[PDB]
Design a protein around this nucleic acid. Structure first.
Length: 135
RNA sequence: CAACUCACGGCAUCCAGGAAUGAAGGAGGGUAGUUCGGGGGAGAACGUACUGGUGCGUCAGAGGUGAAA
């Protein structure tokens, strides 16, 4: 395997970006800089159906097959950053989390310092749609 | 021309006999508190976000919807 030469049985943290939306989930894995990756596995890939990309089953079935790589890279622990659709999109996250997290934690990864990093504008121009909304 | 009790007289002589009703629970104008405030104009900076681009990583899906295209 291609893992660390540092220590044995002493925690090595990665960073995990859990992108939640109403039309997809992603799970992504990086080191600390975010200039280098280890995984990039998306809810969509684990299903065949446009409908069922974002549903909680999909999410979990990504998260599994992420930790199925990360262990081999020597990543024991994780730090987790939760994100929602956009800045002019919704502050509320998708149902692809409360799926994702609850997989990872019971997949034999450790966890610490969960955060919410999502775009919040000081102000924006126009939200897409119209004065009367979608109707 | 001056000197010179007091008078006459001379002096682009002066002030006072309140000589001009009151100061509207009307208006106007002052003086002040470094007063009071998303009031107005000009100039110099600040903030994230949307969008585009560049560099560095990864690799097959991503967008979108009730379901799709």
């Amino acid at each position: 395997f291609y893992g660390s030469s540092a220590a044995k049985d002493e925690l090595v943290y990665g960073v995990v970006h859990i992108y939640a939306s109403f039309n997809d989930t992603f799970v992504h894995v990086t080191d600390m800089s975010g200039r280098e990756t280890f995984c990039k596995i998306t809810g969509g890939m684990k299903v065949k159906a446009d409908r069922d990309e974002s549903s909680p089953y999909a999410a979990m079935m990504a998260a599994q097959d992420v930790v199925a790589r990360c262990k081999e890279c020597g990543i024991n622990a994780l730090h987790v950053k939760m994100r929602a659709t956009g800045g002019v999109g919704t502050r509320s996250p998708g149902p692809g989390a409360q799926a994702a997290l609850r997989a990872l934690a019971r997949a034999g990864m450790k966890i610490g310092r969960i955060e919410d990093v999502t775009p919040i504008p000081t102000d924006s121009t126009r939200r897409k749609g119209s004065r009367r909304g979608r109707r």
